[PDB]
């Protein structure tokens, strides 16, 4: 469960290290974003001379949450941090390396490169 004004670690090599959620997209009064959900974020701390700069407003996708993700069998899968992956203006990943594991909720078409670049997919 990620909501507005939530700090997320950056799980790719886009140059940002921490982002803040400013808008959960996909609903009039939508509250929370889970893994695989698209959010608007502001970059709060980035590495020097990176692709992305501090204070930039752009899109991201949540790739792991501390609340966890449920599976059809009733199991829950949790992580130790909240981490997302930065996206283009067309909601496509801008990453060449993915750090940390991701879940199989990113399976589809627009996050297939995130899935393939992740060191491990749960």
């Amino acid at each position: 469960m990620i909501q507005v004004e939530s700090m997320l670690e950056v799980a790719d090599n886009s140059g940002a290290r921490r982002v803040q959620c400013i808008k959960v997209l996909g609903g009039s009064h939508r509250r929370y974003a889970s893994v695989g959900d698209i959010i608007k974020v502001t970059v709060k701390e980035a590495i020097p001379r990176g692709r992305v700069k501090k204070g930039d407003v752009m899109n991201a996708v949540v790739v792991r949450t501390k609340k966890g993700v449920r599976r059809p069998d009733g199991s829950v899968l949790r992580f130790d941090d909240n981490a997302a992956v930065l996206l283009n203006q067309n909601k496509a990943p801008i990453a060449t390396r993915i750090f940390g594991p991701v879940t199989r909720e990113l399976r589809g078409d627009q996050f297939m490169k995130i899935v393939s670049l992740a060191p491990e997919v749960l």
């Binding site: 199991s75 899968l77 130790d80 941090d81 749960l122």
Partner: protein, 115 residues
């Protein structure tokens, strides 16, 4: 027991045999994974921080560190997803619920071997 007898009759059929194991011992679990038209088994190896026994609804949580961040999954003992469970290493813990290990990162997290 806690459930009604009619419910117990249904649960008994769902019950499936599996190696018994204790808390706090490193375990390897085989999980069915669907990639589309093909089936595969994924190995999940971790210390078991917490276990709950409820007959058919028994569940155990496995915690492992991947790339410097811990991952916890509350696996279901009697579900058909779990093809097999084996105990790689056996450890002794004072308490059933190891919820202090989440705070622990490296040298502290380790559990003493049980002989």
């Amino acid at each position: 027991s806690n459930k009604h007898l009619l419910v117990q009759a249904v649960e008994n059929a769902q019950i499936i045999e599996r190696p018994s194991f204790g808390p706090g011992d490193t375990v390897v679990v085989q999980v069915k994974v669907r990639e589309g038209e093909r089936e595969r088994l994924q190995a999940f190896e971790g210390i078991v921080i917490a276990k709950r026994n409820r007959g058919l609804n028994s569940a155990f949580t496995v915690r492992k560190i991947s790339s410097g961040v811990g991952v916890e999954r509350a696996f279901q003992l009697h579900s058909p997803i779990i093809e097999s469970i084996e105990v790689k290493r056996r450890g002794a813990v004072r308490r059933a619920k190891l919820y202090y290990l989440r705070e622990r990162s490296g040298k502290s997290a380790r559990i003493r071997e049980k002989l």
